[PDB]
């Protein structure tokens, strides 16, 4: 039910190669094998709709001079540079490539996908090459039609339960903003009390503080500043009693139970 | 578009039910107040078709027998049972469970009822297997109202954890192991390549389908793994703690993925 997907690799080592082969084995990878710049350049520009993703090598001779030219003839697709010389520290080609090293070429399969969803993701990509300043390329729009493309063979449609962006706390007026905030607050430091307490209710206070927390839409790094706040609180109250403030670190136990619960409900929430 | 939501709360004390209407004063909420469980249980035989979301009060007298009726007649609907905070199976699987303390943002909590309910029909009733798709009728009804149409990238569902082999099980768990490995290593020095390391292992537990638990279970096998090699070194396996902040972190990241994956 899946769409073949055809991979072009730009590789001059046997044993690269021989891993890329073995991790993309399955009758679903069609691989095109490039052994020089010169191939690579001259099948892209012949098959520039017939490539899904490219896997490139950053230490083959040229590589930057090829992907150069391949920015220049507007061949603009889902990409792995593998490796480094030119594992990569900076981005060489666009916007949406994956970086993969060398050792790593068995994720190959999953690393395939997550470069063709990056790439759907964020097309029209910006090119390294092309662009250098911030914000073919107006007709480089030839990136939407190969996206439009591709999400027709690797896109599937599903329902969703629909969330009243009015109410997610970043579109809230600043009042009600604050009272979402502070229930928010008052449901996690009912977590916090009860964490480590036996035979408490600490699985429907932690539904509730999710709940909240996905309805709301709101981003991991605010239930971290929540958190924060309630150990700023806990902090206070330890140290007007005597107790040390180390027990405070085992509540990123807490932290990460409820971080979970919130990931879990965005996995649990994808169709199909 | 939202559509209007039709609340029906069998509630008999005064606080809870200003609570209620405090909560769900906004007008996308229609409330139906129900004082007995007779009249809950005449209410809900003939508008039957007419209730979004139940609001039940647990201590209510009857409340066993009252929910039983209900689902004996096969009125079974989303739900929110407040108070006993209960800790188990009152009326069915789908159904949430609120403190009468909880309450103040009873909104988001309709919305969770509903959309578990959604996510689980046909689902199990706590008060009892064919014509017991009267649920996938309601069920859809509810969807064309309260759902959208959105795309999401195919993952293949072959190499979903749950679904491979016991080889390419074990593979999978080695190749996510080395990677966080390389979290780990990374974290905490300077001009690593800390980002893209997080990536690549979010990258196989995005794809891959993998419950967070399985995050929970590598980060902690890889803890194992170091607190061996720090005894062998004479030191002290606190220092592991610190590596919280990692897990912390690698969540986060996976979660925001999931997160920013969702369509409009």
């Given at each position: 039910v899946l769409s073949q997907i055809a991979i072009c690799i730009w590789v001059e080592s046997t044993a690269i190669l021989q891993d890329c082969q073995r991790a993309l084995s399955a009758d679903r990878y069609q691989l095109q094998v490039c052994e020089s710049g010169e191939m690579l350049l001259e099948y892209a520009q012949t098959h520039r709709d017939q490539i899904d993703c490219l896997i490139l090598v950053?230490?083959?001779?040229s590589f930057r001079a090829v992907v150069q030219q391949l920015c220049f003839e507007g061949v603009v697709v889902p990409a792995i540079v593998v490796g480094?010389?030119?594992?990569?520290?900076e981005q060489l080609y666009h916007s949406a490539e994956l970086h993969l090293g060398?050792?790593?070429?068995?994720?190959l399969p999953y690393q395939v996908d997550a470069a063709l969803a990056e790439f759907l993701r964020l097309a029209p990509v910006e090119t390294m090459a092309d662009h250098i300043m911030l914000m073919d390329?107006?007709?480089?729009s030839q990136q939407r039609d190969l996206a439009q493309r591709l999400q027709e063979r690797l896109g599937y449609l599903g329902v969703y339960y629909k969330r009243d962006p009015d109410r997610f706390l970043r579109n809230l007026p600043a009042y009600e903003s604050q009272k979402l905030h502070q229930a928010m607050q008052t449901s996690y430091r009912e977590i916090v009390l009860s964490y480590?307490?036996?035979?408490?209710?600490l699985n429907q206070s932690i539904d509730n503080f999710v709940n909240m927390a996905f309805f709301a839409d709101v981003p991991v790094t605010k239930v971290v500043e929540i958190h924060m706040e309630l150990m700023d609180e806990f902090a206070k109250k330890l140290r007007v009693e005597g107790?040390?403030?180390?027990?405070?670190?085992?509540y990123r136990l807490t932290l990460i139970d409820v971080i979970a619960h919130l990931c879990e409900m965005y996995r649990r929430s994808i169709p199909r």
């Open positions: 950053a230490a083959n001779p480094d010389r030119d594992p990569a520290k060398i050792h790593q070429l068995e994720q390329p107006e007709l480089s480590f307490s036996p035979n408490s209710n107790r040390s403030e180390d027990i405070l670190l085992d």
